[PDB]
Enzyme design. Structure first.
Site, PDB file in Angstrom:
ATOM      1  N   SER A  52       0.859  -1.187   0.000  1.00 17.37           N
ATOM      2  CA  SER A  52       0.000   0.000   0.000  1.00 17.37           C
ATOM      3  C   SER A  52       0.895   1.236   0.000  1.00 17.37           C
ATOM      4  O   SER A  52       1.651   1.421  -0.961  1.00 17.37           O
ATOM      5  CB  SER A  52      -0.999  -0.019   1.162  1.00 17.37           C
ATOM      6  OG  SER A  52      -2.066   0.912   0.913  1.00 17.37           O
ATOM      7  N   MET A  53       0.853   2.090   1.036  1.00 21.81           N
ATOM      8  CA  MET A  53       1.820   3.187   1.050  1.00 21.81           C
ATOM      9  C   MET A  53       3.256   2.666   1.202  1.00 21.81           C
ATOM     10  O   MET A  53       4.197   3.319   0.733  1.00 21.81           O
ATOM     11  CB  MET A  53       1.481   4.217   2.146  1.00 21.81           C
ATOM     12  CG  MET A  53       2.364   5.479   2.068  1.00 21.81           C
ATOM     13  SD  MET A  53       2.109   6.663   3.419  1.00 21.81           S
ATOM     14  CE  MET A  53       2.786   5.709   4.780  1.00 21.81           C
TER      15      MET A  53
ATOM     16  N   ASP B  95      -9.887  -4.710  -4.238  1.00 21.94           N
ATOM     17  CA  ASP B  95      -9.221  -3.988  -3.174  1.00 21.94           C
ATOM     18  C   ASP B  95     -10.147  -2.846  -2.804  1.00 21.94           C
ATOM     19  O   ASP B  95     -10.427  -1.994  -3.652  1.00 21.94           O
ATOM     20  CB  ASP B  95      -7.864  -3.483  -3.672  1.00 21.94           C
ATOM     21  CG  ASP B  95      -7.036  -2.816  -2.582  1.00 21.94           C
ATOM     22  OD1 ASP B  95      -7.594  -2.094  -1.726  1.00 21.94           O
ATOM     23  OD2 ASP B  95      -5.798  -3.018  -2.593  1.00 21.94           O
TER      24      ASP B  95
ATOM     25  N   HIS C 215      -7.340  -5.839   0.264  1.00 25.09           N
ATOM     26  CA  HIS C 215      -6.202  -4.916   0.293  1.00 25.09           C
ATOM     27  C   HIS C 215      -4.997  -5.478   1.047  1.00 25.09           C
ATOM     28  O   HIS C 215      -3.857  -5.363   0.583  1.00 25.09           O
ATOM     29  CB  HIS C 215      -6.619  -3.591   0.912  1.00 25.09           C
ATOM     30  CG  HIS C 215      -5.530  -2.572   0.904  1.00 25.09           C
ATOM     31  ND1 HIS C 215      -4.895  -2.172  -0.252  1.00 25.09           N
ATOM     32  CD2 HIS C 215      -4.954  -1.877   1.914  1.00 25.09           C
ATOM     33  CE1 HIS C 215      -3.981  -1.266   0.045  1.00 25.09           C
ATOM     34  NE2 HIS C 215      -3.995  -1.069   1.353  1.00 25.09           N
TER      35      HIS C 215
END
Length: 251
Positions: free
Chosen positions: A97-98, A196, A226
């Site tokens: 993700s980030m 997601d 996710h």
């Protein structure tokens, strides 16, 4: 800032001493190394040195996170990278993700990195960044974003509130990394969940199309949401990353 709260049990970073090849393993926004530790353990068992750093203000309290900046998060990542460089000659980066955004960041700024494996990486989050586009003051916190997981009964160790102050920080990060995607060089194994509910899957397709890597793959995970590192397809992420690493090393 300085963190006021101690690290929650289970959110500790991991520093696994292995061979001359290092894997940097990056967690995401409001998350912690807990979502990444199964991957780190698997990579260490294959012999690699592994660093799974804790982003500043993460794994403690969301009031700590509220005070941090995207440069703080970059600094946590760079410090883990420097730890690896002190003991490894070859370094790979992977992240969720980030953490996948930060994986791309590192490839954009460090041509020495030998390959990357972003997982549900974020360059555009209309539900999150878009929160800042309304008229009139937002509340201090939004709902949690964590634990978007298909497998029942799995809880991510992530914060129960999202600081609105931090949203501008991740937005700045995503803008910068998106703008610099042409600098991504290196072999890339891009994982994306079919479904997601946090990061639009089209992100990974755009990443795939915009980077300049001569060796790149897009792998779609059919049984995960996710937080795929804790989800049904954890095994696929681990196995395919290991094969990718070996192929880059051998070839």
């Amino acid at each position: 800032m300085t963190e006021t709260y101690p690290v929650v049990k289970g959110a500790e970073p991991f520093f696994f001493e292995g061979n001359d090849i290092g894997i940097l393993v990056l967690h995401g926004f409001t998350g912690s190394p807990q979502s990444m530790r199964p991957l780190g353990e698997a990579y260490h068992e294959a012999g690699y040195t592994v660093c799974g750093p804790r982003l500043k203000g993460h794994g403690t309290h969301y009031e700590d996170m509220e005070k941090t900046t995207c440069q703080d998060w970059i600094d946590s990542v760079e410090a883990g990278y420097e730890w690896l460089k002190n003991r490894c000659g070859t370094i790979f980066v992977t992240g969720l993700s980030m953490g996948g955004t930060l994986t791309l960041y590192m490839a954009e700024h460090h041509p020495e990195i030998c390959g990357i494996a972003p997982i549900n990486a974020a360059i555009n989050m209309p539900a999150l960044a878009g929160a800042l586009a309304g008229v009139g003051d937002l509340p201090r916190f939004l709902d949690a974003i964590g634990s978007d997981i298909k497998k029942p009964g799995v809880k991510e160790l992530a914060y129960e509130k999202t600081p609105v102050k931090s949203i501008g920080e991740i937005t700045e990060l995503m803008k910068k990394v998106k703008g610099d995607l042409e600098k991504v060089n290196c072999p890339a194994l891009i994982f994306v969940s079919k479904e997601d509910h946090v990061v639009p899957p089209s992100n990974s397709q755009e990443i795939y199309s915009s980077i300049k890597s001569a060796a790149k793959e897009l792998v779609t995970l059919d049984n995960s949401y996710h937080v795929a590192t804790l989800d049904n397809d954890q095994d696929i992420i681990i196995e395919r990353t290991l094969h990718f690493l070996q192929r880059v090393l051998e070839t």
